[PDB]
Amino acid sequence: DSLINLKIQKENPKVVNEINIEDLSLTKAAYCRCWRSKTFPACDGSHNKHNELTGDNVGPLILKKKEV
Amino acid sequence: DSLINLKIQKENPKVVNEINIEDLSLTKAAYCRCWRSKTFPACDGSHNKHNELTGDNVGPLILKKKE
Ligand code: FES
Ligand code: FES
């Protein structure tokens, strides 16, 4: 029964982020599911240190947008 | 120093899920960031029980199509 989010918007009772698909410009964009990214909601690779430290296996959600 | 993901795909060293945006069927789709959903990588509202149990404030990432 451990907290998952330690640092992000603790004054907020539920941190929910929205992505409007039409705004995604990159063919590939990674979003954080570990709550350790310094650019949250984006993934910055911080999951890797978390995984090494705790022995976890978390990773990001990758949103893929085909080239029109 | 504690685990975030307790039970999802433990045989996999790093769980990464790819979403093909062009194939979203719903205008609003919620994706799990708590690692408790029974429909992972989709959010099924399991974050609410996690938050109540632990006092946390995690919630989903929501993808929205153009209006
Ligand atoms: S930094 Fe959190 S999933 Fe990559
Ligand atoms: S069930 Fe995990 S964020 Fe909703």
UniProtKB/Swiss-Prot annotation, chain B:
Signal peptide: none annotated. The chain holds residues 68 to 134 of 135 of the full protein. Testis, small intestine, kidney, lung, brain, heart, pancreas and platelets. Residues 1-67 are cytoplasmic. Homodimer. Interacts with BCL2; the interaction is direct and disrupted by BIK interaction with BCL2. Interacts with BCL2L1. Interacts with ITPR1. It comes from Homo sapiens (Human). Regulator of autophagy that contributes to antagonize BECN1-mediated cellular autophagy at the endoplasmic reticulum. Participates in the interaction of BCL2 with BECN1 and is required for BCL2-mediated depression of endoplasmic reticulum Ca(2+) stores during autophagy. Contributes to BIK-initiated autophagy, while it is not involved in BIK-dependent activation of caspases. Involved in life span control, probably via its function as regulator of autophagy. This is CDGSH iron-sulfur domain-containing protein 2. The gene is CISD2. It is linked to Wolfram syndrome 2: A rare disorder characterized by juvenile-onset insulin-dependent diabetes mellitus with optic atrophy. Other manifestations include diabetes insipidus, sensorineural deafness, dementia, psychiatric illnesses. WFS2 patients additionally show a strong bleeding tendency and gastrointestinal ulceration. Diabetes insipidus may be absent. Belongs to the CISD protein family. CISD2 subfamily. [2Fe-2S] cluster binds at residues 32, 34, 43, 47. It is found in: Endoplasmic reticulum membrane; Mitochondrion outer membrane.
